[PDB]
Amino acid sequence: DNLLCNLREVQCLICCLLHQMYIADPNIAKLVHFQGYPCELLPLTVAGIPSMHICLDFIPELIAQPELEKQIFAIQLLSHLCIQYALPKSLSVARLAVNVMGTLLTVLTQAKRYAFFMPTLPSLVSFCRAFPPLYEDIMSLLIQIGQVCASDVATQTRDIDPIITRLQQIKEKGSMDPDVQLCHCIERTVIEIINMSVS
Amino acid sequence: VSSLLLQRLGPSSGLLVDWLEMLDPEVVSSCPDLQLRLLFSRPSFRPYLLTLFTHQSSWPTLHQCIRVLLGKSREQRFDPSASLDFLWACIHVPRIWQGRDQRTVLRVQGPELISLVELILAEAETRSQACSLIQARLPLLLSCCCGDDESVRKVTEHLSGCIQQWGDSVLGRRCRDLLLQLYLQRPELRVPVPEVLLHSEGAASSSVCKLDGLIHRFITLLADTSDSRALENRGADASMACRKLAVAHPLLLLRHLPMIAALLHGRTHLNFQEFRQQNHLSCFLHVLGLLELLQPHVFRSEHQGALWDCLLSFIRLLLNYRK
Amino acid sequence: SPSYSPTSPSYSP
Amino acid sequence: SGACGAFVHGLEDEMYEVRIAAVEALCMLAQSSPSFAEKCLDFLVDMFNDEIEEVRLQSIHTMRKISNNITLREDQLDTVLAVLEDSSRDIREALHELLCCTNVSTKEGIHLALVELLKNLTKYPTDRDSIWKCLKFLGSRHPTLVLPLVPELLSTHPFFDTAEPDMDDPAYIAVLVLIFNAAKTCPTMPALFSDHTFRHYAYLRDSLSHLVPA
Amino acid sequence: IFSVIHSNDPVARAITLRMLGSLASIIPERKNAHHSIRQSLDSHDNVEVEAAVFAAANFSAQSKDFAVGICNKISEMIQGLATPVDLKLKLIPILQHMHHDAILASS
After folding, report:
1. How far is residue B87's CA from residue A127's CA, in Å, rounded to a whole number?
2. Chain C touched by B100 (CB under 8 Å)
3. Which of A27, A51, A57, A58 to mutate to test the interface with C (most CBs of C within 10 A)?
4. Terminal alpha carbon distance of chain D
């Protein structure tokens, strides 16, 4: 049950040790996050390590990196930090992240768009949780990505064809092609946002 | 040693307790039923053994113990107090929370949660022969529900069944008490309110709610009816939103009746011409519509006092504009 | 600083 | 016939002994007749700018005795509060004692009241215990009027998490004293707090137990 | 000295609590320090809790107000079940410093 396991005790010990290391040398924290680690660990390492609010001081530098995976990790790390520390500088970096994610929507190709927006789209519900003033920007970005992906879906024959599923209901909760997957991901984060705002 | 202790045993109990601490490290490892009836049943050294079992046993051991405590569908054999304290201790073992900053979540299935609320009711019945203990055990229930809507709804319907089956027993009254507290803590469940809860009186005493801050924000926001027309349409959205919230979830508004009384106390004395140019009569009209919706749940004792104050403000305004 | 939470009470020398 | 405007003559006399006697007569007469008390409130307010400090102190005492059951309006309230800037600390604490017993009409009155009180804190910091007593009673007696001010008082933000306000800061302790005291009889109030306000509540509980309630 | 009790680092908090315990002689009845001992008592880090216990011992030896305030917390901490046995063991002999008052000693 996660909370009551030897894994959780080990996680707490490792978090205490990493907290000591990051206090001793914050450059280690910056280096580790530039390298990145599995995104599955992000709730654990953001909750359990009180010295991760310093990450907000180099998320803009991590976003600027040319590697797509560093950018994706920056978006995910920022989303978890914003849900943790809802500061004015946290919102400023969230605005920057939404802007950079809306900017490279028109820079990426088809495959890179799928690769970038499948992990970074679940970060938008976290931004919207933390910062209600981002709703206009978030939904404008979301409608832009949705229209781009619908256009891309229409280009080729598809097994699912989400366009003619325009009036389907909620799907509260796997060999499909990437464009339909990204369409469904956009819808899924939209229901998560609306559910969060209404609950 | 266990048989000797289960059997009175004044001075030598410490010796035997030391002994089974020495030779039974995981406490309930050997002959589990003997230790289960030692730790949880209907003694003196019980807290010491409970502390050992909490902070000395493996996680599968405690998992099996909580499955035993919550999987007994006939017993009422284990003590409610010891079992509930043990569950709370297990949730809050320091080893699980080491390193957290402590500045701003257990999974359990349906029948286990039903057994948990039955054990809380057993606690309440044992103590009544107050709402303090039943409120005290409430965060344990919420820590086991983890905010799952399905679990909240299942507990709600089980409590409705318990109220109906028990009639108006003392335990039925306690069922209503924790049901209203659960409705307060999780009003996201949009179930219509049964009349049995409307007849409940304890909602308007000291309590804790989740949405009271929001509706407080709503009414103070609607009250600032400044001259900006965009803000005026925003206030109109606030008024009709409060109308819908009044018809949908009345009781949360009913704990905000002195709120509207105070809001109307402020603006009554001001003159007629400034009354119309600063647009405060619309706020009176809005809250009048609210209260018109809020009936007949707006007609109990504390509600009656707030209404009396509000009507004094109303007639003061009426006499203020007799000309 | 990594050792203090952002919401901690600030120290005024 | 010949009994029109006698008290105004007594209060507009040159012998301060006559004025003290007249204002004491006003105190006793208003005490006997509660309905009479409404008409003398404004006259007493003028006496807080009197020349002799004993006359001012006595007028403050009379006001505290007779304003118990009646209400102040906004202009009378602010004129009462504006004299807090006076240097005489004795009339300042007397005026505080009045404010323990005064009654406010509107929440803006309370906002003006504690704005003036914390301004007094900035001016005369040694009186901070008395001002905390004043706020204790102010919150304890207008709980329903203090609550819609609470989010403004605590500077709480709709979504941001605020910096933990500096504990053992006299103005902030005063604000908390007012808010907690209003929360003694307002169960909806505590859910409007933040976490560090609960922490500071515990701190003010143990250190200022006589002031702050459960 | 007291400012570093707000550091999120539990070792820094532990050293601060021990510092206040060392300074209990010169500054007892400093109520924010009392509050720090009380809040750090129910903390999660083991080093912070031990430092809080040591500082509580010193302040109970010094302040009567702290002793009467902390006796109830210690009673509910021993009677609390999440407190392990060794922490209970370290927690009991704070009570040898309850010799400031007759009703305190009787309780």
Report:
1. 35
2. no
3. A51
4. 58
